Structure formats: C-alpha cells, structure tokens
Amino acid sequence: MEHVAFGSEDIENTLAKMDDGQLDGLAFGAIQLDGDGNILQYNAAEGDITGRDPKQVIGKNFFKDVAPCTDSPEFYGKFKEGVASGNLNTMFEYTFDYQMTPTKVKVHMKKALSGDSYWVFVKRV
C-alpha cells in the first residue's frame, strides 16, 4: 500500500514516479486523463469503487463513453475550465450512478506534472 493520503498538497509530485503497478497501491481511486478526457491510467481502487475493469477503460473517453453522469458543468465543466486555465485543483463531492448502484464519492481533480495530463482522484464518502 503506497503511503499517500487523499488530498495531499504535493500529490502530483508523489504520483509522478508511479507506474501502473504502484498506482494500484494507492488507498483511493486515481484516474489520469488527457486534456480531452481520454483515460491514460486507471488504478485498482477506482475499479473497486466503480466496477469497471482498469485495463478495459484505458483509451476510452471518460466524459463521453465511460462516465456520462459526469458530463455536466459540475464535473466535466470544472475539468475543462481547469485544463484551459492550466491550474486545475478542485475538490467536490459527486454521485456516480451510470449502470451502477449510486455511489457518493469525494473527487479531487488536479493537474499532473506531465503537462497534458490531469488527475481525477476518488474516495468513498
């Protein structure tokens, strides 16, 4: 289990060193998206929260295909505003309910260090 807390101030530096295997060691869900919302990384804890197979969602568009319930100003809108500005860092609660039992989560979106990369972190609430 990787020793990183959800919402930590330097999380983007800590996660910069992690291959897909170390990402699976996190205590919380972690998704990496490009600026368009395409899934670059998707860890085991997120698969546990959502039911999706982490290997099978890589390459899919999060907002268009995987997670349409986030296609809204309250989630996607915050994401694309942060991508456009280049300083994405926002935390909010949300309910995931597409083809799943509705699940309330806390979401932290933060711009990655890798430039055109953005983290979406998720934990249960």
Ligand X SMILES: *C(=O)/C=C/c1ccc(O)c(Cl)c1
User: Which positions lie near ligand X, rule CB under 6 A?
Assistant: 31, 46, 50, 52, 57, 66-70, 96-98
Distance between CA 38 and CA 101 in Å, rounded? 24
Q: What is the largest CA-CA distance in the chain?
A: 34
Q: Which residue of this chain has its Cβ atom nearest to ligand X in the complex?
A: 69
The sign of the dihedral angle between the CA atoms of 18, 25, 14, 46 is: positive
Q: At its nearest, how many Å lie between ligand X and the CB of residue 104?
A: 12
Which residues make beta-bridge pairs with 96?
Answer: 103
Shortest spacing between CB 27 and ligand X, in angstroms: 16
d(C-alpha 80, C-alpha 113), whole Å: 17
Distance, CA of 5 to CA of 28 (rounded, Å): 8
SS3 102: coil
Is there a contact between 1 and 116 (Cβ–Cβ < 8 Å)?
no
Report the nearest approach of ligand X to the CB of residue 58 (Å). 11
| C-beta of 35 vs 68, nearer to ligand X | 68
Least distance between ligand X and beta carbon 102 (Å): 9
Q: Which is nearer to ligand X, 31 or 109 (CB)?
A: 31
Nearer to ligand X, 73 or 86 (CB): 73
Would you say 11 or 107 has its CB closer to ligand X? 107
